[PDB]
Design a protein around this nucleic acid. Structure first.
Ligand SMILES: [Mg+2]
Ligand code: NA
Length: 316
DNA sequence: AGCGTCCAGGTCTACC
DNA sequence: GGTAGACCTGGACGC
């Protein structure tokens, strides 16, 4: 297919959004386990599917530059203002990250130290269905393997969009495409392990028991506590996966995922231990208490502070 | 030399 | 509700 674009080579095809590097670092966000579907196909340029089309993104010191491949056999052109608005919404640029970093650092000297080296880590606003099934794939697993799982799931069950160079881009599958009893066996062939059943059973539960796709919008409109409880009915969704979906797709900025990294960060970097349980190791009660500890420390956007520490912990 | 253990964005099941 | 251990997969890497 046609080439993945670079800004300096094809300037007529790009348009900018005001966005300083203090507000966003693509290299610290897009490969860090929020979305699994972006790749640095040219140095400093990240390509992936965003609002149903492929985009490439790159940045200068003060701007986020964007290019879109419409794949409808139309003539190439720069993104329009209306298309750029989808990118601005995906990066939630109405939230001023530099102010949150100052708040978090004022209450937490450890955060302040890490933040100095990890500027521009913000939270993507993701599609609920993509986020749900990506995080079902994430449990007891590592980011490189999760990334492959998600790519193979999309290639097998999602619509083909376009090919750039030798990369064929697919959209994320629908609920219906993931729900049939033949799907688990295919996802097992694709190496999803025991999560193959969780993916297909969760798609069937949403369609057959929760009222279909509108349930995810209902959870976006519900409180954090209500949304988190509701997601936990799904096979493969426990309190951590539910917190990931709440934070990253359901607009719950105080949701704090607690995985292996955040548990070890609490112990190593905060000397924290639970005080609501005599036994101190990970457990439902202690993982719950740890989420509450980080909310109490960082405030109503505690999940966003978690994303900074998580991204940094991947690099150490 | 390469096997085998540890480990990774945890959840489920069984049992008390 | 608390506790404990199994669990698909494959890269890191000690022995
Ligand atoms: Mg569940
Ligand atoms: Na609903």
């Amino acid at each position: 297919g046609p080439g993945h674009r670079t800004l300096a080579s094809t300037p007529a095809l790009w348009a900018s959004i005001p966005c300083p590097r203090s507000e966003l670092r693509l290299d610290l966000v897009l490969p860090s386990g929020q979305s699994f579907r972006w790749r640095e196909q040219s140095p400093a340029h990240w390509s992936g599917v965003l609002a149903d089309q492929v985009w490439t993104l790159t940045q200068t010191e003060e701007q986020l530059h964007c290019t879109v491949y419409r794949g409808d056999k139309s003539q190439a052109s720069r993104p329009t203002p209306d298309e750029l608005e989808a990118v601005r919404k995906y990066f939630q640029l109405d939230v001023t990250l530099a102010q949150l970093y100052h708040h978090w650092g004022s209450v937490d000297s450890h955060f302040q130290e890490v933040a100095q080296k990890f500027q521009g880590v913000r939270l993507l606003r993701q599609d609920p269905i993509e986020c749900l099934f990506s995080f079902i794939c994430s449990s007891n697993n590592n980011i490189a393997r999760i990334t492959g799982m998600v790519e193979r799931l999309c290639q097998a069950f999602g619509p083909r969009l376009i090919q750039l160079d030798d990369v064929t881009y697919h959209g994320f599958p629908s609920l219906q495409a993931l729900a049939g009893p033949e799907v688990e066996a295919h996802l097992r062939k694709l190496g999803l392990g025991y999560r193959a059943r969780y993916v297909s059973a969760s798609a069937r539960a949403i369609l057959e028991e929760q009222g279909g796709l509108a349930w995810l919008q209902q959870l976006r409109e519900s409180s954090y506590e209500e949304a988190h409880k509701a997601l936990c009915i799904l096979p493969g969704v426990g309190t951590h996966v539910a917190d990931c979906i709440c934070l990253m797709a359901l607009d719950k900025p105080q949701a704090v995922p607690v995985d292996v990294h955040m548990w070890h960060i609490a112990q190593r970097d905060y000397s924290w231990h639970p005080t609501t349980s005599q036994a101190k190791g990970p457990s439902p009660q202690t993982n719950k208490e740890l989420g509450n500890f980080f909310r109490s420390l960082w405030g109503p956007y505690a999940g966003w502070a978690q994303a900074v520490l998580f991204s940094a912990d991947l690099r150490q």
